Write a protein that binds this DNA or RNA. Structure first.
Lengths: 108, 83, 96, 101, 99, 87, 95, 108
DNA sequence: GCTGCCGGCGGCTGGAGAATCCCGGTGCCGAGGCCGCTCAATTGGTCGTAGACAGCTCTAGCACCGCTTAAACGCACGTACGCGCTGTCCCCCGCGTTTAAACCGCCAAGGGGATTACTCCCTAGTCTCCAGGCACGTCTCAGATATATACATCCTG
DNA sequence: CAGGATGTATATATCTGAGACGTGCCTGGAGACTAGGGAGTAATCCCCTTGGCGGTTTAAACGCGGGGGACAGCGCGTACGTGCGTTTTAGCGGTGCTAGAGCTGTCTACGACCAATTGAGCGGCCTGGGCACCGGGATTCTCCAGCCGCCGGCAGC
């Protein structure tokens, strides 16, 4: 009969069959459940949506309609919790957050 | 002046601008050579694992996959080059 | 010309169309996002499998990954992610 | 005649600090770094080649590590009631960082 | 008239003596109560194993021994012998738990 | 008086002598009257990270008793693995 | 009931074959057990990760060898790969 | 007939069959090679023997015939080649080495 | 006294590099339609991890009193803190200019990578044997004291 | 500037005592002997992308000069952390004394396993048009720098 993707019935634009296959062939466990790939796709979708919104806000700040890896670095390092999550991560073409020690500044 | 060590290719202005991006306004005169030493130490540490990964592949090239894997193994992940 | 590789490009673009519908994404940024989501997926799956081995279980269900994300992500992302996973699994089970 | 215009010592340094902090460009030249990495990797495997992507990734990882180490070094320097980063400062920062000992 | 050690003689004696020992530094029921008190916040109605409490105490003891090593090193770098809060703050900043 | 023994003001129980001995083990010559609170603070922060992960492990295990497995296991998770507790 | 598992007797034999007149305490014995288990898990994870990178579904002696090279520093790595190689050749001589 | 263990055939004192079973059940790969458990047992044997002669030398120095975690730390933290491997791990009832900064020492 | 004089004081405008911003067109290439292929869904049946239920029992949580041990307060002080003076001298900031980075183009080729037949190195099943965990069980050799002196420390003459 | 008296440590003789080291017991795990079956391995070949070559061209690094302010040694006010004496307060601890839930065994079942079709999601492969970039140039933005009324001494008388 008529077929339909599992992502449509799972309410997520992220794939379900793809994550299922990745879990299957990734040598993690002997078996995985049916809802486990759905949950993993959902959490991955949330993570990408959050980081993409944080980067797009910085993109509009820098008046760019296209997301550049510098925007991704700014979004990652600006959010304290996201910075804690990606603490030991080196970004491509991102640079560093602009900060200067106040002691090095002149008297006035 | 054409035969020089490749470690000296890391020149004083370049390390100075690296420090400036770091956020330090004043640098002493004995920082350059020791920073060169620690930089080369980090290089040998990462490239040892990189070349080991390449020899596992039974290949003579060092593609970006080996270097990102070696950096991740050392404790510094890196994004944008595959993954 | 052959061996079509696999990546999350279309999925990240689709997510972008629902968060910033009039915003583009650079190719380098696309590679960064693909690598980041692959790394996060690998870390979460490794934690889930590691806990499954820990409690002497041989299957990975939504509970294992739920405990993994509650274990991995700190702060508000943990609760938001577990809520998203719960609503997604309930939606999937409701219409099977 | 008028003394030629000069910035005070320690201001153009801050200006270029501002300039480099907002720039994501590669602070290390392509060719000297490639020569250095090949000269330091030839001992592991004689006549070994690298990919362009691999070498730029390695260089940018090295820059990120060195810039973070330098920022920690500057933090320690300002902690020790000074502004000049000294060799003892960089050794101390490395040794707290856990990479030296 | 009375005999008094110099201000640091007994300090150095304590350093050279207690460093060679390996037992737990601090009384036990303090950590037991403290660990129960903190664990109450995360989830109530818990049940601890003794070995778990010993492990927590030893882990914390080692963590603060290493931390005081770092702050002593920072202080000796700052051309001083005493230690101050900024030493602990600097050591935790470079280590990376707060960053 | 069967259960629900809520405890408060227990961080202070680490005496100043106690921190003095801990730092002597760390190898200091002198001290200040100002560390005794931030060392307590780093104590509390450390323990919330450890037992947070420990109770998440326990809750995943469908059990209430926290074995030494959970604490050493979360400790290994934090990159500070401990030897000598069945690891 | 429910027989447990430990690396006690093996480290025992190792110390007896290198120190005929030295004993080991129980807590240090469990420390040795944790040491062995941690290193074993580290090597096994490294080998599995290497096999997954190289699109390999099997783990031979070569991935173990490379993990030993890349994980332990210098002299320990070279000595350990030497012992592993001689042991594997001796085992393959009479399998 | 004539069953013989793999540890004896490889001339090793660590269980090759047990290590192979652990690799099989540890979800590391779909298949495991024959020489991999042999290599693993050999490297674990070398490492154990290594730290063991350090511990025995420390105990003989401390004129004791029993091995305690104090000897284990005193042996591990003296040689930096082993420190680079065990610098992150701490052991139960370990302690530290008697190191005093030269400035903290008296005038003479 | 009641005038001269003498240096700082900081407040300000003004001269002067650098940073920023808009237009302007030119490149460059993220974004979008097409094809089929490669994988994902889908029926159809299986079988085996993981839940339940029924206990069992080892282990977790408590208070209690001798008691001593270390915790706590306060006490004098000599030190180490924090800082001011000073005096290098060593980093800084421009400047000319020497040089090597890059970028440009075009090859040569060692090698990365997709297909192929297979073999043989591993896996799956049964049966067989035994190395190792466990429950004891000791006799120890490992700890643990109170004792007798070295010692190095703070002074004295 | 060289010794004496002292709170520290050092051996060290019995006590004294939890626990490394066997030791049977048994058993589930290791291992030996067969189908069998695809994972990797040489063999093959086809791009390809990496090394190598040599003009521009040009930003950039290097050596050098002037100077200024950062740093380190010397001296001093001080406050305060330490050694120590005198309390006192909570920990140690061996003791029952209690229940709590992990833990093991067993029955069951249902959810993942895998198979044979079948169709579409999407990775690729162009492809035109839309967005980032570069240069000139006008606009701010700080930076440092001397002029001078106001201010406070500074000597006489």
């Amino acid at each position: 009969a008529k077929a339909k993707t599992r992502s449509s019935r799972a309410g997520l634009q992220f794939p379900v069959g793809r994550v299922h296959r990745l879990l299957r062939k990734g040598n993690y466990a002997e078996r995985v459940g049916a809802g486990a790939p759905v949950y993993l796709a959902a959490v991955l979708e949330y993570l990408t949506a959050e980081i993409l919104e944080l980067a797009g806000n910085a993109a509009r700040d820098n008046k760019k309609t296209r997301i550049i890896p510098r925007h991704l670095q700014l979004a990652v390092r600006n959010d304290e919790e996201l910075n804690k999550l990606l603490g030991r991560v080196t970004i491509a073409q991102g640079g560093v957050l602009p900060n200067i020690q106040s002691v090095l500044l002149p008297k006035c | 002046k054409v035969l020089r060590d490749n470690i000296q290719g890391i020149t004083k202005p370049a390390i100075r601008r690296l420090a400036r991006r770091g956020g330090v306004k004043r640098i002493s005169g004995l920082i350059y050579e020791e920073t060169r030493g620690v930089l080369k130490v980090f290089l040998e540490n990462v490239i040892r694992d990189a070349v080991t990964y390449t020899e596992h592949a039974k290949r003579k090239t060092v593609t970006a996959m080996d270097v990102v894997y070696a950096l991740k193994r050392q404790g510094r992940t890196l994004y944008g080059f595959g993954g | 010309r052959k061996t079509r590789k696999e990546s999350y490009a279309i999925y990240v673009y689709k997510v972008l169309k629902q968060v910033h519908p009039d915003t583009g994404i650079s190719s380098k940024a696309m590679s960064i996002m693909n690598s980041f989501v692959n790394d996060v997926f690998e870390r979460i799956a490794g934690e889930a499998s590691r806990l499954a081995h820990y409690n002497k279980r041989s299957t990975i269900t939504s509970r294992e990954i739920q405990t993994a994300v509650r274990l991995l992500l700190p702060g508000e992302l943990a609760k938001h992610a577990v809520s998203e996973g719960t609503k997604a699994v309930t939606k999937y089970t409701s219409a099977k | 005649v008028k003394k030629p215009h000069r910035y005070r010592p320690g201001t153009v340094a801050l200006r270029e600090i501002r300039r480099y902090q907002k720039s994501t460009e590669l602070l290390i030249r392509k060719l000297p770094f490639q020569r250095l990495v090949r000269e330091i990797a030839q001992d592991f495997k004689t006549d070994l080649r690298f990919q362009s992507s691999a070498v730029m990734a390695l260089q940018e990882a090295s820059e990120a590590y060195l810039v973070g180490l330098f920022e920690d070094t500057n933090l320690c320097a300002i902690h020790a009631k000074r502004v000049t980063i000294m060799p003892k400062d960089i050794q101390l920062a490395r040794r707290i960082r856990g990479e030296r000992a």
